[model samples]
Target chain A: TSIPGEVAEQAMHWHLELQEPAVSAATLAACMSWRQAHPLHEHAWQRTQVFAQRLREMR
Target chain B: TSIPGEVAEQAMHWHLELQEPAVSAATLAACMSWRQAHPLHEHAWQRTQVFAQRLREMR
Candidate 1:
């Protein structure tokens, strides 16, 4: 099934947002809430994590 | 062969940096150069793109 472009876009934005110097617990909570609001959000974030892990293993 | 931790860390940083609002062509070129610096870097970036594509397909 195809996810909506807007949802994917927002997830990507959140990925970047979480990395900012000023990111706080509240921001993290909001991100958690946003991901919990939809399965696609959760899945998108999962993919990013998995991708990072693979990159870490690259030689 | 295992890639060094620092290289993997820098690749992840570059991933986050490329998403900044003011990202420029020069910054993108730098990212390309960094990835080219090692096959692992290039592979890591490729995994990111692949992961994003997979996320877009998630429902």
Candidate 2:
């Protein structure tokens, strides 16, 4: 499989959650931990990164 | 209020779905229709756009 939907969903969650000012270091640590959890997770995160990249280029 | 998680989830779904070569015009049309569904949807879409923007800048 390329990347799972639920995996992408988790990545999306961190994508928004990590932006909060009140988010703690524990949250960041947990997020990174999740990032390292699986190959699909990493792949999904990268795709989101590039998706964001493409959006900027489109602007 | 900030973008809702469910709206963000929908935006994230479209973010991945639109990239598929197998997707049809109807899918794109549907995604845009969802984008126009509500203020939260629009705001969520904009945030995802900027989130991707920030990712590219982080490089």
Pick the lDDT winner: 2
Please list the residue runs of candidate 2 whose C-alpha ends up more than 4 Å from where it truly belongs after superposition: A1-39, A42-59, B21-23
Sliding window of 10 residues with minimal summed lDDT for model 1 chain A: A1-10
Location of the lowest summed lDDT over 10 successive residues in candidate 1 chain B: B21-30
Work out the TM-score per prediction: 0.42, 0.49
lDDT per residue as tens, model 2, A1-59: 35677887898898778545333333444454565567678678778878877998999
Whole-model lDDT, candidate 2? 0.65
Q: B13-52, model 1: which lDDT tens digit per residue? A: 8777655543433344355457656778878776776775
Residue-wise C-alpha lDDT for candidate 1, range A1-59, written one tens digit per residue: 23344554466557656746788898899999999998977876666555444544663
User: What's the distance in Å from true for residue B45, model 2?
Assistant: 0.4
TM-score of chain B of each: 0.65, 0.77
Per-model CA lDDT versus the true structure: 0.63, 0.65
Worst 10 residues of 2 chain B by lDDT: B1-10
Top-scoring candidate (TM-score): 2
Candidate 2 docking: what grade?
Answer: incorrect
